[PDB]
């Protein structure tokens, strides 16, 4: 069971899907969606 | 088994996620190196 839960939702280029993970870097991770270094959760992605 | 003997060198070249796997090697090996010294000094202290 989970304390409280936030689902974050957004769209990105498929190459940039590697940048969402905690500790990664690049043109979206540095500038508009950073996960914390010690994150817990799941990241889920599909082409649309 | 770390990439380097020098703590600053490990931090000069690796990111947070990868650096910790090298640093904790030096922490584990140096903490053994102290526990050997302190045990040996307690055994010397018991003779003195």
Q: Give the method of determination.
A: cryo-EM
What is the Rg, in whole angstroms, of the alpha carbon atoms belonging to chain A?
A: 11
Is residue B16 within 8 angstroms of chain A, CB to CB?
yes
* Resolution of this deposited model, Å: 3.1
- What span, in angstroms and rounded, lies between the C-alpha atoms of B38 and A16? 51
3-class DSSP state of B10: helix
Cα–Cα distance list, A37 to A11, A20, A26 (Å) = 22, 12, 15
Is residue B21 within 8 angstroms of chain A, CB to CB?
no
- What span, in angstroms and rounded, lies between the C-alpha atoms of A39 and A20? 11
Show the tokens assigned to B48: 């003195």
> Taking CB atoms and an 8 Å cutoff, what residues of chain B touch A37?
16-17
From the number of C-beta atoms within 10 Å of its C-beta (0-12, 13-18, 19+), residue B10 rates as: buried
Place of tokens 């959760």: A41
Residues, chain A: 48
Is residue B34 within 8 angstroms of chain A, CB to CB?
no
Place of tokens 């526990």: B35
Please give the span between the terminal C-alpha atoms of chain A, in angstroms, as a whole number. Answer: 31
Residue of A nearest to B15 (CA): A23
- What span, in angstroms and rounded, lies between the C-alpha atoms of A39 and A33? 13
Alpha carbon of A31: minimum distance to chain B alpha carbons (Å): 18
């Amino acid at each position: 069971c989970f304390t409280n839960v936030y689902a974050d939702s957004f769209v990105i280029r498929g190459d940039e899907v590697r940048q969402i993970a905690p500790g990664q870097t690049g043109n979206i991770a540095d500038y508009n969606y950073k996960l914390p270094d010690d994150f817990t959760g799941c990241v889920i992605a599909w082409n649309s | 088994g770390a990439i380097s003997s020098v703590l600053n060198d490990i931090l000069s070249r690796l990111d947070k996620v990868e650096a910790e796997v090298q640093i904790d090697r030096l922490i584990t090996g140096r903490l053994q190196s102290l526990q050997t010294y302190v045990t040996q000094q307690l055994i010397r202290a018991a003779e003195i």
